[PDB]
Amino acid sequence: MYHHYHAFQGRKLTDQERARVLEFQDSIHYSPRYSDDNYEYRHVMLPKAMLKVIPSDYFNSEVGTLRILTEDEWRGLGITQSLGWEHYECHAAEPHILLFKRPLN
C-alpha cells in the first residue's frame, strides 16, 4: 500500500515550536464566512497569549503583525480551515487577527 506526499511550502516549525503553538489550538476563533460575487471571506482570531510562542521569523518585525503566511504555515500554527483560503496582511490590524479570502470560482 502506498500514500501520496506533500512537500511543505514555507518555513516548517520545529517539534518544540509545534508543541508550544498547538497548546492554544482550541482557543482559536473562526468567524463565519461572508461573500460577495467574486470572493468568500473569513477572519481568524488567535488568543493574544499565543503570540508570545509564535517564532519571531513569522512576524513582520517592522510593524509587529504576522507576515503573509503560506497555507502550510498557517495550517501548521493549528489554524484549521478548508483548502484554498489565502492570508492577506494588514499593518493596522491587531497582531492576533488574521484575514483570509478565497475566490468562489
Percentage of helical residues?
A: 10-25%
CATH architecture: 2-Layer Sandwich
CATH class: Alpha Beta
Question: What is the overall shape?
Answer: globular
Outline the biggest β-sheet: 5 strands, antiparallel
Annotation field: number of helices: 2
End-to-end span in angstroms? 34 Å
**DSSP strand content:** 15-25%
**Number of β-strand runs:** 5
Structural class: alpha+beta
PDB class: transferase regulator
Keywords: protein kinase activator, ubiquitin binding, transcription, Cdc28 kinase, cell cycle, cyclin-dependent kinase, transferase regulator
Assembly: monomeric
Entry title: Crystal structure of the P93A monomer mutant of S. cerevisiae Cks1
Written description of the protein model:
This is Cyclin-dependent kinases regulatory subunit. Binds to the catalytic subunit of the cyclin dependent kinase (CDC28) and is essential for its biological function. One of its GO terms (biological process) is regulation of cell cycle G1/S phase transition. One of its GO terms (cellular component) is SCF ubiquitin ligase complex. Keywords: Cell cycle, Cell division. By secondary structure, the protein is an alpha+beta fold. It has a single domain, classed as Cyclin-Dependent Kinase Subunit Type 2 (2-Layer Sandwich), CATH 3.30.170. 13% of the residues lie in helices and 20% in strands. The protein contains 2 helices and 5 strands. The protein has helices spanning 15-22, 71-76, and strands at residues 29-30, 34-35, 39-45, 86-88, 97-103. Strands 1, 2, 3, 4 and 5 form a 5-stranded antiparallel β-sheet that branches. Strand 4 (86-88) and strand 5 (97-103) form a beta hairpin. The chain is globular, with a radius of gyration of 14 Å. The N and C termini lie far apart (34 Å). The relative contact order is 0.24.
